[PDB]
Design a protein around this ligand. Structure first.
Ligand SMILES: Cc1cc2nc3c(=O)[nH]c(=O)nc-3n(C[C@H](O)[C@H](O)[C@H](O)COP(=O)(O)OP(=O)(O)OC[C@H]3O[C@@H](n4cnc5c(N)ncnc54)[C@H](O)[C@@H]3O)c2cc1C
Ligand SMILES: Nc1ncnc2c1ncn2[C@@H]1O[C@H](COP(=O)(O)O)[C@@H](O)[C@H]1O
Ligand SMILES: [Mg+2]
Lengths: 484, 55
């Protein structure tokens, strides 16, 4: 009866989808996905994200047909113009979507809402992706909180205002001729370049995008894995963390459903006085809270590395990209990143601070490489991550923190099984040395079949030299900004 | 049919130690060029405020 356009972007799911639920509650729906590369500009998504999105759109397309509707796809030069044509052809009186918080989407969402309103069309946006909107949390005088622990302590002293919605019985279709709105198939979107297919063959075997695969993954994690998360999450190899990140990034599983499941387990385990389980749930929910926090700092705080004397050496960049640094944890991480499109958070910390602190590579280079190879590449989580390793955030790493590989290995890969899996050249090293083989007695290297420079790279920088260059780099950063 | 966690486990075991990272990335030519005024536009201030008001 009432006709409503449902504009999908990063909410590729049916369950607890507020915009889709509101539209279906009012009448018939026209779901559409509008792709405008020129409007994404600086933040056009990378190879791994575009591969994932393409698989997930086809998954969602199938889901919407079975429900009695469809997903229309439009590659356009202008999002407003494509939406205005969908309105002209179908006759709908309203556009709904789930709003996003990245600067491109904020501005574009604002531009759509202003134009539709002046053209006499109703528009409404909905919180599809957060437990707490970025403006709901503030202190005693009403300002941002500027610290994760304080932000999360304040969040747990409030309740969620978000309200989960039940799924629709049927979707009432609105049909339009593909030719009247310049629509196309998923392959005509160009999400995947011909030259990318060989790399993307690794991601195909490793992952199945799509909201129904997210539900399967969330159920298996909650029901069998959350209990041990406090212990598993401290190792970087094997079964460590939930693997939910790509699905959360594309909205394929609602964070309100993630939290409900984990919180209810936490309450069960509190009653069973199962304290290890309560810790796990608590630690896992803190991860969710970091993701809320990433939106919160990107929405409220409108760079202390401004004057850092980066060594723009494209050769040592290649050596970082290829895992030819000679630091095992770093070289393992970059291999895992290329072959699976994902890595453990601590390996993300190690690899990124190695680029910045040991190599003095410009941080935008490592970000842009992450942006092209991570399935879960997410602007706000990535910003927060680089802020955390660069000392640009209250409770993070300090900029002069030079982590010792020997201690990182003992903490996060205490059996050495991460090195032995990704760097089999090193697998015969006693686990005592496997994370810093340059300190081992030459007799041990030789008994273990390691020859630095021939079958595993020599350290591309010495830690003691790196600490000196980093201290100089910091002095000149601080001397310079006082001088300018 | 196998779970995602186990599909990733299997793939990890198949490819680990056996996949070279290509010698060319494809974006080398952009390195030296590599702004963040995306977060400080007048437009984004207006949109943030508009988004708060409509909630
Ligand atoms: C340099 C750096 C860059 C990063 N870039 C990204 C990115 O592009 N996309 C992305 O999703 N995450 C990024 N992260 C954090 C990332 O979520 C974890 O590093 C990784 O997601 C673990 O995946 P998981 O689902 O198994 O984590 P789990 O611990 O099992 O699940 C926690 C979930 O909550 C969120 N979460 C957990 N830890 C963090 C965290 N430190 N920061 C923000 N959110 C978190 C995520 O949605 C995550 O999927 C980055 C971290 C660093 C240090
Ligand atoms: N205040 C924070 N801000 C941003 N990211 C954080 C913060 N605290 C933890 N993280 C992430 O959580 C991980 C665990 O931190 P830690 O307990 O200090 O080892 C870090 O390595 C970061 O990736
Ligand atoms: Mg992790």
């Amino acid at each position: 009866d009432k006709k409503t356009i449902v504009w999908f972007r990063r909410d590729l799911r049916i369950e607890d989808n507020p915009a889709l639920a509101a539209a279906a509650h009012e009448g018939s729906v026209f779901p559409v996905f509008i792709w405008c590369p020129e409007e994404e500009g600086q933040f056009y998504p990378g190879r791994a994200s575009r591969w994932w999105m393409k698989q997930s759109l086809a998954h969602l397309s199938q889901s919407l047909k079975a429900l009695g509707s469809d997903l229309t796809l439009i590659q356009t030069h202008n999002t407003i113009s494509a939406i205005l044509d969908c309105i002209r052809v179908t006759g709908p009186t309203k556009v709904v979507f789930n709003h996003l918080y990245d600067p491109v989407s904020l501005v574009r969402d604002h531009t759509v809402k202003e134009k539709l309103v002046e053209r006499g069309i109703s528009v409404q946006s909905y919180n599809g992706d957060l437990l707490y909107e970025p403006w709901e949390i503030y202190c005693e005088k009403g300002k941002p909180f500027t610290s994760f622990n304080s932000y999360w302590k304040k969040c747990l002293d409030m309740s969620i205002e978000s309200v989960m919605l039940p799924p629709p019985w049927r979707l009432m279709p609105i049909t339009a001729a593909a030719e009247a709105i310049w629509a196309c198939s998923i392959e005509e979107l160009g999400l995947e370049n011909e030259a990318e297919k060989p790399s993307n063959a690794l991601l195909t075997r490793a992952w199945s995008p799509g909201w129904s695969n997210a539900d399967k993954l969330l159920n298996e994690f909650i029901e069998k894995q959350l209990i041990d998360y406090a212990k598993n999450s401290k190792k970087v190899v094997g079964n460590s963390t939930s693997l939910l990140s790509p699905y959360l990034h594309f909205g394929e599983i609602s964070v309100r459903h993630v939290f409900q499941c984990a919180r209810m387990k936490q309450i069960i385990w509190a009653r069973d006085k199962n304290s290890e389980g309560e810790e796990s749930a608590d630690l896992f929910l803190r991860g969710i809270g970091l993701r809320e926090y990433s939106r919160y700092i990107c929405f409220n705080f409108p760079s202390h590395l401004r004057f850092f004397p980066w060594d723009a050496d494209v050769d040592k960049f290649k050596a970082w990209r290829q895992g030819r640094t000679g630091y095992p944890l770093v070289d393992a991480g970059m291999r895992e990143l290329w072959a699976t499109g994902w890595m453990h958070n601590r390996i993300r910390v190690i690899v990124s601070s190695f680029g910045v602190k040991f190599l003095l590579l410009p941080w935008k280079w490592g970000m842009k490489y992450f942006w092209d190879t991570l399935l879960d590449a997410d602007l706000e989580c990535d910003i927060l991550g680089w802020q955390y390793i660069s000392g640009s955030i209250p409770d993070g790493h300090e900029l002069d923190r030079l982590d010792n590989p020997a201690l990182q290995g003992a903490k996060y890969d205490p059996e050495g099984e991460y090195i032995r899996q990704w760097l089999p050249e090193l697998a015969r090293l006693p686990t005592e040395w496997i994370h810093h083989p340059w300190d081992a007695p030459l007799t041990v290297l030789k008994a273990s079949g390691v020859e630095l420079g021939t079958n595993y790279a020599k350290p591309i920088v010495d830690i003691d030299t790196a600490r000196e260059l980093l201290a100089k780099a910091i002095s000149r950063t601080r001397e310079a900004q006082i001088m300018i | 049919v196998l779970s995602g966690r186990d599909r990733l486990k299997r793939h990890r075991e198949e490819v680990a130690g056996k996949v070279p990272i290509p010698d060319s990335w494809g974006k080398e030519g952009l390195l030296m060029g590599w702004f963040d005024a995306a977060f400080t536009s007048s437009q984004i201030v207006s949109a943030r405020a508009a988004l708060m008001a409509d909630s």
